Amino acid sequence: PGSMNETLYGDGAIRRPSVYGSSIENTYAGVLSFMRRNYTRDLDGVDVVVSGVPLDLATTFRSGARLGPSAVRAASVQLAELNPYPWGFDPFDDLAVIDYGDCWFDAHHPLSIKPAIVEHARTILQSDARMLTLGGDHYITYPLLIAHAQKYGKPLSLIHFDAHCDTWADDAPDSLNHGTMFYKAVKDGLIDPKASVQVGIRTWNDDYLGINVLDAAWVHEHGARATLERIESIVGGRPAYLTFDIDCLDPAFAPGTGTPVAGGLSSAQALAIVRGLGGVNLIGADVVEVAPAYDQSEITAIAAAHVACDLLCLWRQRKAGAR
């Protein structure tokens, strides 16, 4: 440890002295941080912080998303072995990404959870790192948006991939519900519906609150490039937060989720869209609702890890293009 010209074969997440660079791993072993990034709470010189919020108390059907962050970390091992495709660079050579670990909260006092998540995000945002957050159920995005609006102003543009709009009316602000937190976000003025977009939608709301909806059928009909171009058109250059609910994907591709809805996107379609979002002013992102107890050979977590990897690459390109 620390010896001159020490080669780092294995366990880079706990051994690498710098936030930059990859190191050799056996894919089936080694410390399982997200894409093997350094485990640390030190935020100096960091561009992106990956962290987990292991919540499933706000779920309406199956529970299990509390284990989502660990599942996505475990599923990210192969993505660490090679330069991401089609990017063809190692993003960690010039993008400083760490794994913070998780947002602790006291589940047994559930009204403390929302402020715990706001404070977690507030703390990270004081560093000027971007947040890439692994869920956990979709409720987490509401306090994340609160903290993001503090830093980046309001209203924000939301880019929301989901089978569900999560904007069903809820007359109780204090409720812990993964299906009504974007109703609250709109009512709080956190997000601008006319400059926001929901992609892969295939469930019904009497009032989508004026948010642009590109439903699953629309995506299938028009294709990924058309979808990507419509997203760019809607958000323009506004500060945008991207929230990816893995149940956007068809249950064939994402069986490991609490509220599966037939007729969704393939991972190919979703990734083609995410990979093309380089023109967007992406301020923060999350990937939510992975429930490993319902996963099958980790395929859901693997797809979630790919989304997260492509989000990192988008940030690498933004940093490298401004250099």
Which residues are part of a known binding site for Mn(2+)?
138, 162, 164, 166, 245, 247
Candidates 150-158, 244-252, 281-289, 311-319: pick the segment binding a copy of itself (CB under 8 A): 244-252
296 counts as binding a copy of itself under rule CB under 8 A: yes
> Are 137 and 55 within 8 A, CB to CB?
yes
Q: Is cis: bond before 91, omega within 30 of 0?
A: no
138 counts as binding Mn ion under rule CB under 5 A: yes
List 62, 122, 151, 319, residue binding a copy of itself (CB under 8 A): 62
List 36, 64, 95, 283, residue binding a copy of itself (CB under 8 A): 64
286 counts as binding Mn ion under rule CB under 5 A: no
Shortest separation between residue 43's beta carbon and Mn ion, angstroms:
28
The two tokens of residue 80 are: 């660490």
316 counts as binding a copy of itself under rule CB under 8 A: no
99 counts as binding Mn ion under rule CB under 5 A: no
> Are 123 and 49 within 8 A, CB to CB?
no
From the list 27, 36, 53, the residue with the least C-alpha distance to 290 is 53
Q: Which amino acid type is present at position 58?
A: A
**Looking at beta carbons only, is 190 or 219 nearer to a copy of itself?**
219
138 counts as binding a copy of itself under rule CB under 8 A: no
> Are 201 and 165 within 8 A, CB to CB?
yes
DSSP, residue by residue, 213-264: EEEHHHHHHH-HHHHHHHHHHHHTTS-EEEEEEGGGB-TTT--SSSS--SS-
Shortest separation between residue 81's beta carbon and a copy of itself, angstroms:
7
From the list 58, 50, 55, 52, the residue with the least C-alpha distance to 184 is 58
CB atoms within 10 A of CB 204: 9
Candidates 8-16, 149-157, 191-199, 230-238: pick the segment binding a copy of itself (CB under 8 A): 8-16
Candidates 151-159, 226-234, 236-244, 295-303: pick the segment binding a copy of itself (CB under 8 A): 295-303
Candidates 84-92, 154-162, 191-199, 315-323: pick the segment binding a copy of itself (CB under 8 A): 84-92
217 counts as binding a copy of itself under rule CB under 8 A: yes
List 91, 143, 239, 260, residue binding a copy of itself (CB under 8 A): 260
Per-residue burial over 65-103, b = 16 or more CB atoms within 10 Å of its CB, e = otherwise? bbbbbbbbbebbbebbeeebeebeebbbeebbbbbbebb
Virtual torsion, Cα 6, 8, 14, 20, nearest 10 deg: 90
**Looking at beta carbons only, is 31 or 209 nearer to a copy of itself?**
31
74 counts as binding a copy of itself under rule CB under 8 A: yes
137 counts as binding Mn ion under rule CB under 5 A: no
Of residues 240 through 279, those in contact with Mn ion by CB under 5 A are 245, 247
Number of C-alpha atoms within 13 angstroms, CB side, residue 20? Answer: 5
Contact set with Mn ion (CB under 5 A): 138, 162-164, 166, 245, 247
